[PDB]
Amino acid sequence: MAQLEAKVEELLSKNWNLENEVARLKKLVGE
Amino acid sequence: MAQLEAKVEELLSKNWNLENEVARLKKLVGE
């Protein structure tokens, strides 16, 4: 598999972690 | 240009918007 696939996977994982962080912050503040 | 490029661009832009949101939240709370 091309190392390019690994970089796209990293971008997806980072996206998910950011979204989940934001989701947890929304729950904390009641949003 | 392949529509695939547009999707990767969307992923990058979303990543940037999430990071910038988190960065602004850190500034708000003093982190």
From Swiss-Prot, chains A, B:
Domain of life: Eukaryota
Disruption phenotype: Abolishes recruitment of the mediator complex to the upstream activating sequence (UAS) of amino-acid starvation responsive genes. Decreases RNA level of genes involved in amino acid biosynthesis and cofactor biosynthesis during amino acid starvation or methyl methanesulfonate stress. Growth dependent on amino acid supplementation. Sensitive to amino acid starvation. Sensitive to purine starvation. Decreases cellular glycogen levels during glucose starvation.
Subcellular location(s) of the protein: Nucleus
Coiled coil: none
Region (Leucine-zipper): 4-25
PTM text: Phosphorylated by the cyclin-CDK PCL5-PHO85.
Induction info: Translation is induced by amino acid or purine starvation, or during growth in low or poor carbon sources. Translational repression during nutrient-rich conditions is dependent on four uORFs (upstream open reading frames) present in the 5'-UTR of the mRNA; these promote ribosome dissociation. Translational induction occurs in conditions reducing translation machinery efficiency, leading to ribosomes scanning over the uORFs, and increased translation of the mRNA. The rapid translational induction is followed by transcriptional induction at later time-points, independently of the uORF sequences.
Entry's family note: Belongs to the bZIP family. GCN4 subfamily.
Entry note about domains: Residues 89 to 100 and 106 to 125 define the N-terminal activation domain (NTAD) and the central acidic activation domain (CAAD) respectively, which can function independently to promote high-level transcription of the target genes.
Function in brief: Master transcriptional regulator that mediates the response to amino acid starvation. Binds variations of the DNA sequence 5'-ATGA[CG]TCAT-3' in canonical nucleosome-depleted 5'-positioned promoters, and also within coding sequences and 3' non-coding regions. During nutrient starvation (low or poor amino acid, carbon or purine sources), it activates genes required for amino acid biosynthesis and transport, autophagy, cofactor biosynthesis and transport, mitochondrial transport, and additional downstream transcription factors.
Subunit structure: Homodimer. Each subunit binds overlapping and non-identical half-sites that flank the central CG base-pair in the pseudo-palindromic motif 5'-ATGA[CG]TCAT-3'. Interacts with the mediator tail; the interaction with GAL11/MED15 is direct. Interacts with the SAGA histone acetyltransferase complex. Interacts with the SWI/SNF chromatin remodeling complex.
Protein name: General control transcription factor GCN4
The organism of origin for this protein: Saccharomyces cerevisiae (strain ATCC 204508 / S288c) (Baker's yeast)
Gene from which the chain derives: GCN4
Part of the full-length chain shown: 250 to 280 of 281
